[PDB]
């Protein structure tokens, strides 16, 4: 199957999962909105009111589309939506990871000029080490983020929900980044347990600190007897692996009548212009258009 | 590569990972203990003092082996150990999952007579739904656990760290199972945030409850506007899939001289008896014995 | 793709092709009939009024389904229907042909007890040789037909459109079988050209006969200088190949929630009973139910 | 197996089939002609007396070769020959079809500069639609033909037996192309049934016309109730697919002694020059020369 | 390609090679003998005058066939024949070697009841160790030989040229087995160099012995400073591997007309009985009979 | 498995085999020498005292490494060493043989500018034919050798043990090349049997010559009745095959921490510079460094 969308499911999955793209009429909130034309890129499904259509509800004049995503690994309730992580894609071309050189799927593609790809396991370790070592980048408008692991300019991650890959515990810490940075510069420490967000002052010599629990100063986990995790000691990129890890009018004949059909951007919905055919079909699957292709890969970029 | 050991790495991975088996002399705590014979089953590496050897440390009389495991996905500090999840194995035979029928690896194998296998994704959902729906089984000696999804007798999970697969947040809740069961039977509710373990009494009609945060009574997550996760509504097993999902003097010739060599249980260390050969080798890999085979698959059962 | 239906397209294909199954309301002849339950076997789509549903047309009280098939290799007009050849199936199990031992697809499966399979190339040659050698079997109710090539009892082909595989020219001759058999028993000959269906009497010695054209008596094609086609000289079956060429409560877990779902006969439409899920899905494809699965493989037997 | 020759078998196959190339002495018509050198291209086997050899018949002085082809799918009588369709080749390089983009075999290769390839299914539909829509090209010397589907100059098909792919019925119509074009320009209609080649005049308003049967004016098949086949409504080529669908002293060492041997054009017969070896062998198969290689692929171009 | 015959090429190959089977008229020694029927087993090509045919030579009355084999890896002179090693076969079924458990080809199949197979590398080492350790079995009629490595009864190798696998040097020693056994029982030693077959008496204490060169007593190679080859120290068979290493009216339809044809023993030459077909073909290859199939696999057992 | 070393095993194998690279302290001859850094090319293991390390023997001051190779196909005694054939390599890139065009492994790579590769079967035949036809090249310093089969300049083989591929018998003859060339230029003949190296004078007309055995003058094997081996009659290279048969700061991330690690020449031993990791690993295998990688592929060039 072809998945062009990945979401962060906060529960029950608590991880990145293939998602289902859905539409509804923005005015009556019903699944009765038939699109004039399908979405062809992320902006079409992320920016309010980008796209128009016809509501088939009885007395609804609604004309605007409202998109949302759902985790596909299990049943979901009506409003159990998840956030789309648009940087994450199926690794069709089998691009190697910039860090581990393995071919993995799905992958995260940075918005740097080179479009470097990183597997999720490596992105996770990247975020965790930068968080622990206080190496996130402050952006006054966005907040705290990270660029491409290669340190390319103009690659700061903008959709901050990608940091959900940190994990529940670490993500909460990340949400407190600004506050903790303050506490630290005064020589203080922040209790890591979520409920108790209490500030604490210990002596700069001691590494063990206690609160209303027992935790380690440098590592911020439960106090330990010797040394913190080897990964948390204290960013160089293999020149070859980084080159290998780059992410790099189109028509196709109608599957039924073979007349050339023009593709609209990344949109997978094809409409045959031939008046005796008029086949509506999926660019990827070659079959007639249907709800599965819509949910799984309405567009791909 | 062949991994016979899986551990729960609490950080930085925060998930199940292939582990490395290590030995040290129990008396001097140094990696100088040469085993008289290798471990051949889980009891040999889990039960204190099961196995004997020779310490090569200067003045150490130590003769007993002490085993421990480490996450292999990243560097680890000297005492960064992880707990072995002995129910989890590589799915070599490509057994289907009892629940989803997919072939996955690694898998968890229950200790029921049928040895049913379940993929980790499904085991995770199983634990999460049973936790939320308060369907764990109390065992006075062990604590709270779950049997095989098929409900087979004598299949209660004994090594409770397998529930780490719940996730950090859910695992903490699970650790409070006995306490919360008390609070619930009095009609009370337990605050879900880890720091604030505060008991709370609301009216039995209301679903929204507030504490020193805003959460949902039935779901125990942040309060939501409509209905809880579809998976948390309120155990039948597909008869075919369950049958498909079952887990079912041995010698081999020396790779060098071809004399038959007897295998000792699940131990992968083979010792050729032929006096002009004496090859020490790996049952699985066919190469001479070395530290990689020891760490990755010293034994397999 | 999975095709469970094959039709004879009379034009433009003039051959056996994968077909599309369609439904309409029998009373208003519109594609507005939603089936109460899908077809599960050939009788459900071949026998009038077998199945019931709901017409969604404005003022239509229609409740009965009317099925028809269309060639799928090209656009078709509204009423360009083709006849289903229900003996013909995809060779999923890779059964060898009873005659040539090759694995081919699709294949024709005879209705003999052994369910012998024959590839279409071989079925074609079988029909052509039996036609030329006057070895069709008369059945007073049906007309003229052929049994299994192995000569098994109760294997007479009933849906005579399977003989369309003869080809346009030969099929016309076959349609004249009774008449020609009469002409032949009087020592006469029938002109083979379709327009001129003229009876002709020549001398029993001559093989060349002329009509209002020039054709051969024994072969019924254009007169030739020497001997008829080697295949038309004048039925033994390889015992091994014939054995090899035999065609030999089921549930499956919901792809979304994994509850076991019961299959209804050969019907591919699955309906999850789990009230928080209710997934409608394809037994074969594992995806949610849609128009493609309906057209291509609504049922398979 | 490697087939370099395809023929049209008029019966019993009534379709394109792999053919067998044969030679005989042109003077005694016996299979006793040993070629001085083998054919190396189509002209060598198509043009009378191109090639010389030695007849091994008793008192025959014959020195000239006469080539002919036979269908290989079944036994053939002595003079059951079939016409070679030299445009048709095995698709070894897996070139995509110019129309459907599928990789098929065998394929027809047009004689345009680009050497566009078209699968037989698509060539068939091309001929049928052009025939029905009266879009064949008149060439006073040849007769009626079609160029490359891309409309490339100097691509008119010259060997008209390639139109046999039309089918028996349609081919007869095609043979009447000039006559029917006359009848049509006077506003008349030609009866389609082969025997009755009768001209008919109906009123220009009516579409139904009757003859000494009932047929449709526009479609020329049996009269129908609504609309003609969707393919027969009334030539644009996908620029990408057309580029993809292009068809684009050589020595090889002796398989036995490894001395380099020069290939003669497309001829597969290799003769080792090494005096202690003298191996005669097949360029393609690497085995010694034999009757199978001769029949199946004496040459390939 | 399919090779049913293996020979020992004494030069230039000096090893086991696929061989070519040839026939000639026994009386005129010319390759003009056409077999009445082909060989169907080893006895047919090994035992004089087993098979009859027709000589096509001018005035030769010869009727008896004389078979011989030639190495196929290079050109051979007219009488450059090699000895057939009939125990050696292509390992089509991928039987494991009784000693090394590897799947190799070709293999030697012992004539024990179990038909144990051994790869050539292992057979070679078996012969070499038994030779050096003086463990060949004396058979007064045959000479010196070895049975199956498993020590099965009635498995003594009869065609002694299989010991050519020893190698040129070791084979010469083997040819002197009886003589050397005599020299050894008197406490003497035989010089190993082929030219100098001189008997020598040294003192039973010394291991170094000199002749008209310097060699080792126990090893019979050039004198060495320490210990003989580890393999030459001084027969147990892995029960599983030995079981794994066992070697375990037939008709087929004519490739052209599909009439069942009876196979004659191991003979690959098939003759269709159908009078309008009469195809002569190869059981294995499915193509018409030719010189390549004859040379490579005229029969297989 | 990856083998970078091939040796000539003189017994029991008597052929080219994958070898094991070993090290010892040059002063105490014990396997206690730990290399400061591993070998990175042939010169490091072939030239005395190239490399330094630390002896771990009690009172040994030894600091120099001494390398040697052993046949790996069977047990070897302590000093059973074999000669490394450094021209021979695993054919990883699947280069075709310059002579037979087949892809074989291992292959011999000549030291010509083009680095032509030749499979061992072909190299063997090359040496045998040149030996028999007296076409070896004299080099006053080296002795007698052969260049690249293509006759490229500066390609003379320097390590003469590569001629061991001749075989035991032929190799002895080759060792007598200078002497025999003398005997031949006087019109004399050398007896081929190893023990009897006797010079012999026959009449220049006769081909049969007898000694203290019966052998052929031209062929130097046992006298034969007709013509010598077809290969021994009396060097042209296929231009295409010869082009096809050419043999054509590097870092890699640490498998554990992913920091880029610099490779040292052909050495496979990698040492991670990251102070919290320090993984020692194999470039090829990606696993931690061990005795198997050392023996099989310590370096590769
Ligand atoms: Zn989810
Ligand atoms: Zn609306
Ligand atoms: Zn990665
Ligand atoms: Zn970047
Ligand atoms: Zn706290
Ligand atoms: Zn710490
Ligand atoms: Zn279309
Ligand atoms: Zn799709
Ligand atoms: Zn970890
Ligand atoms: Zn100790
Ligand atoms: Zn599962
Ligand atoms: Zn169970
Ligand atoms: Zn709280
Ligand atoms: Zn809730
Ligand atoms: Zn051994
Ligand atoms: Zn191993
Ligand atoms: Zn059609
Ligand atoms: Zn209706
Ligand atoms: Zn068939
Ligand atoms: Zn039957
Ligand atoms: Zn007529
Ligand atoms: Zn006829
Ligand atoms: Zn469900
Ligand atoms: Zn489906
Ligand atoms: Zn045919
Ligand atoms: Zn003639
Ligand atoms: Zn096509
Ligand atoms: Zn063109
Ligand atoms: Zn008519
Ligand atoms: Zn019409
Ligand atoms: Zn040759
Ligand atoms: Zn060939
Ligand atoms: Zn040979
Ligand atoms: Zn004769
Ligand atoms: Zn073996
Ligand atoms: Zn045996
Ligand atoms: Zn001697
Ligand atoms: Zn010795
Ligand atoms: Zn036949
Ligand atoms: Zn054959
Ligand atoms: Zn060896
Ligand atoms: Zn030393
Ligand atoms: Zn070669
Ligand atoms: Zn060269
Ligand atoms: Zn001599
Ligand atoms: Zn000779
Ligand atoms: Zn590292
Ligand atoms: Zn390695």
Numbering used by the authors:
A (entry chain A), B (entry chain A), C (entry chain A), D (entry chain A), E (entry chain A), F (entry chain A): 142 to 353, 362 to 383, 391 to 404, 413 to 465
Study authors write:
We generated sufficient yields of soluble protein from human Parkin construct spanning aa 137–465, which was codon-optimized for expression in E. coli. Purified protein was crystallized and the structure was determined to 2.25 Å resolution using the anomalous signal of the eight coordinated zinc atoms from a single anomalous dispersion experiment. The structure of human Parkin UPD-RBR revealed four domains with unanticipated inter-domain interactions. Central to the structure is the UPD (aa 142–227), a previously undescribed elongated Zn-binding fold in which two central anti-parallel β-strands arrange two Zn-coordinating loops. The RING1 domain of Parkin (aa 228–327) is a variation of the canonical RING fold. The C-terminal RING2 domain shows a fold that does not resemble RING domains but rather the Parkin IBR domain. Parkin terminates with a C-terminal Trp462-Phe-Asp-Val465 motif, which is the centrepiece of an extensive (686 Å2) hydrophobic interface with the UPD. Importantly, Cys431 is also located at the interface, buried from solvent, and inaccessible for transthiolation. Superposition of Parkin with RING-E2 complex structures revealed significant steric clashes of E2 with the Parkin linker helix that connects IBR and RING2, as this binds RING1 across its E2 and Ub binding sites. Hence, our structure suggests that the linker helix between IBR and RING2 inhibits E2 and E2∼Ub interaction with RING1.
